[PDB]
Amino acid sequence: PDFLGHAENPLREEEWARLNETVIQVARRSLVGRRILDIYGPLGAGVQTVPYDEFQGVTAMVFTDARKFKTIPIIYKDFLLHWRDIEAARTHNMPLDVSAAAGAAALCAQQEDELIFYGDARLGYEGLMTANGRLTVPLGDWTSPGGGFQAIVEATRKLNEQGHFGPYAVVLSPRLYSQLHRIYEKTGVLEIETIRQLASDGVYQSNRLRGESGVVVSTGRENMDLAVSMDMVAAYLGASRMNHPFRVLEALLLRIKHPDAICTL
Amino acid sequence: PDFLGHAENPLREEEWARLNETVIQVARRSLVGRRILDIYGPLGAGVQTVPYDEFQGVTAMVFTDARKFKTIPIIYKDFLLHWRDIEAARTHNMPLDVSAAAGAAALCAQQEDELIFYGDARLGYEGLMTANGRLTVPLGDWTSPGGGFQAIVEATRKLNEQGHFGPYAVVLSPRLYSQLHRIYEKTGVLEIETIRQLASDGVYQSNRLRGESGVVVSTGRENMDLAVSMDMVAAYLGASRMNHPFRVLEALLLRIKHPDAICTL
Amino acid sequence: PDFLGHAENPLREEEWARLNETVIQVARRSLVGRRILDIYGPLGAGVQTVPYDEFQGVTAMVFTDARKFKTIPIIYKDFLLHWRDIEAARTHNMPLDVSAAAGAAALCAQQEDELIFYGDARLGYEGLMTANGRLTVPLGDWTSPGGGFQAIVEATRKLNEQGHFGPYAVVLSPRLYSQLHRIYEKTGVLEIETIRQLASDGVYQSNRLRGESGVVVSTGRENMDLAVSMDMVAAYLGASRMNHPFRVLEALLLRIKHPDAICTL
Amino acid sequence: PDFLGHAENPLREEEWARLNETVIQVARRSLVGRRILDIYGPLGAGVQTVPYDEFQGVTAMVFTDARKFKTIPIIYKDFLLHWRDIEAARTHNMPLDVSAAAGAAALCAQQEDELIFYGDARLGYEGLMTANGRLTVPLGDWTSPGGGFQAIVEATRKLNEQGHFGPYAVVLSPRLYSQLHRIYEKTGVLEIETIRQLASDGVYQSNRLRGESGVVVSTGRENMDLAVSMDMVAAYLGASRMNHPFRVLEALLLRIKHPDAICTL
């Protein structure tokens, strides 16, 4: 009967394909970090450590590669399919409900963006909001109509003088996004279109930022990367008590190879 | 073991293809000069001199081709891959990190744009900012709202009277770009849209220009060319001390076949 | 002529085999550390980081493998074969002189033993003489006939009470080795035979130890390992100026997975 | 991907062979009981009860085999391999780390020797230190130089008068082993060589014995056996939460078929 037995992929190939498509699609729709960072290609699930810097190195002599090494975190969320649903979908209703997968993937991607913007801060992971040498600037009197473009211009000037010209990118909190998206306030048209023309790559909004945020970054690779050990895939754990629990995995590591292209408002 | 040996392409065909794709892609994204100049097709790395003018020529008689001849410069930047990384990527992590290639290509393309806009000025190379018979015009009181469009109009009029009508193109410094991109200042809408409609080919911004710049040019071929000896390719030098150093090459020459279509602000 | 050309293995397969045999043989004869430490098998030259501990680990949740990660050093020594010698040995004298390889390998193995016993101490590497939680004991009045066996017995008792019984091993400095190897001094026969019977694995002498040393360790695996990235092989660098320089490589890392089985005199 | 699936031997045949070789090798090195007891051959994991005596047996009549029957204990220790390590070793580093297996096997073999020498004493299991009819003898004034050989001689005499001549074997505690291994103390040479010549099979040391111990036994089969249900093998339990837990099994039973060849000091 094949269901009075333990395990080894209760779902068929079509159902696995549908599940993976759903999880990948909702991840791609939700994630905002993966739209300004070039990704070090998918290395495979085997790797656990990746270099964090750039290779600039030159009786017996000993040579120790002194760049840096950091371990790759792993993000997961659990979800459960009832016993009878799979057995039905194998003969009964051809669709298999994958609502739980969508919910789990949404939570996982939200945690991913939170991890990129804020590091764990005690495990040693760093982030676009906590990187050392962050080029911090003050962003005060934002409520004044026309006081947000000034901070963006001074920030991009500070990055230009440090040697980092080229296309920029801006990630703003929802409140600041609305404030800059509502008013004209300086000379001409809405004071988010001028910033969008200044950034030349895009101005995005991230829900994970706190009340006041808004870093501008230099989108070029070799400034900041994103090591993808493996993209979001759904994995089967094992039939606990004749049900079927799964897990959606992801293993990303932000590496700030050059923390000069960061400027926090 | 193939790594206790010297040389001859440590990278496989797939890795070479990825490296060349990365370098070409970042070059194409960064370069601004190659968007207003038609390119004399890639001649191959063999050539070292190209004619700089147009052929208009008519006891024994001697005939000397008296047009002009100039040598083609070559732009390069070095980068280094560690020894173990290639050996790993051959069996371990399938990706090979090409961050260094991206950085080197960005620097090389920046130097390319600098070379086009400013010549070497002592090696004899000339440029859109230093060409003789440049049709120089004064650009003063730019800060006055509505004082930038006037200079563009007088410049395009000066080019029209010299016999060079047709589509134009404008390359402005970042400061002037923002100043014209921020204000309405004359009659109607933002005073960069009217200039964009006047130019009919595009108004671009180049980071390599100094504080005050902004030439307008006639985009037609036979007015100004761009001799491409070879596009940006990554070349392997030779394993110095069991590491692997590379070099990204480029050989371009701007030739101003007719310095009437230039006007510096 | 094949010698008016650059590179790619000037030596034939027989000569390479002889060279590798010589270097491996002298290494195996000289090394004393590899006789009390089980080796994590040769991982291949690709790997650069290995775990330093034992896996004991258990809105979305993030899991960071928190054991430890350390990079694998690399030990090398250079040697040079004259130009004409290889060309002769290809037709003239069938032997190729490999004296330089033997000297380089001896120096490399000496540095290896020094590295195992003393860590680099500033690069972060640790060693049987500097490990934290070392169970230090005082070894005074060694000159007194019969005062060396007492220290060994108290040290092995201290290890027994900590939970580490099983076979032991002892590594003594040359001076202490002679002192214990010269005198009877307690009850019966030479006071190095009783210690040898107590250790049950062997009492060895290492030249790299300073004046006063003599740790006793528990030889079992899972107490202390030795990660072998690659054994000593001779590698060819590249014909600099028509000569032929080589290099003998080695990449070992001592990992003290459990610094309870150490006791320094 | 074969790792987004549950179970059925995550390790390949080579890795299983290496694991079993490591566990068996460390067991064989550590165990001291299996060096004086002939083993009733490996019966297979199926059996759970073995006879404990020797068959000496002769309206309807009923015949009940009245020898004895005892159940075979099972000794295990758990260890865990991380999720990513197996996936890496399948493509990345060819070695698989088996340190945990070595530690678990060492603990299991230590428990085995403890079980042989001391029975469970409440489950009914018996041992060379607790067997009834043990021929107990007093071993006092051991510290006196030459007072240990006397006890061994009187013990072997007591066994000889009981009808059990033939080769003997001696298992002594570490303290008594050192005391007899340090002094000459009677007539000639070290007072452990004479006992070794008296025993004719070997004098061994076991760490599991308490402060004062030292039985001498008659090594012949049919006096005392060792029923091996199955030797130490590593078994896979099942992927709990995408990790991989294992277990090393062993099922031995000491059976004292004739408790006359025992004499406790």
From Swiss-Prot, chains A, B, C, D:
What does the sequence similarity comment in the record state about its family? Belongs to the encapsulin family. Family 1 subfamily.
Biotechnological utility:
The encapsulin and a cargo construct (an encB-encC-encD fusion) can be overexpressed in E.coli and in human HEK293T cells. In HEK293T in the presence of 0.5 M ferrous ammonium sulfate nanocompartments can be detected and used as cell markers. Coexpression of this nanocompartment with a larger nanocompartment from Q.thermotolerans (AC A0A0F5HPP7) allows expression of different sized iron-rich particles. The encapsulin shell proteins do not seem to mix.
- Mutant phenotype after disruption: Does not form fruiting bodies. Decreased survival when grown under oxidative stress (0.5 mM H2O2).
Keyword set, alphabetical order: Encapsulin nanocompartment, Ion transport, Iron, Iron storage, Iron transport, Transport
Something else known: Shows substantial structural similarity to gp5 of the HK97 viral capsid, and while the sequence homology is weak, it suggests this protein may have evolved from a viral capsid protein.
Q: What does this protein do?
A: Shell component of a type 1, iron-storage encapsulin nanocompartment. Encapsulin nanocompartments are 32 nm in diameter with an iron- and phosphorus-rich core (4Fe:1P) about 24 nm in diameter. Upon expression in E.coli most particles are 32 nm, 20% are 18 nm. The core is filled with an average of 14 dense granules, 5-6 nm in diameter that are not evenly distributed. Each nanocompartment is estimated to hold 30,000-35,000 Fe atoms. The minor proteins EncB, EncC and EncD probably lie against the interior face of the nanocompartment.
Which subcellular locations apply to this protein? Answer: Encapsulin nanocompartment
**Induction annotation:** Part of the MXAN_3553-MXAN_3554-MXAN_3555-encA operon. Expression is induced by amino acid starvation (at protein level). Not present in spores (at protein level).
Quaternary structure (record): The 32 nm encapsulin nanocompartment is formed by 180 subunits; monomers form pentamers which assemble to form shells. There are 36 pores where the pentamers meet as well as 3-fold axis channels and dimer channels. The N-terminus of the protein is inside the shell.
- A Pfam family reported for this protein in Swiss-Prot or TrEMBL: Linocin_M18
Primary localization: other
Give the highest taxon in the source lineage.
Bacteria
A biological process term (GO) from this entry? iron ion transport
One GO CC annotation, please?
encapsulin nanocompartment
Q: What is this protein called?
A: Type 1 encapsulin shell protein EncA
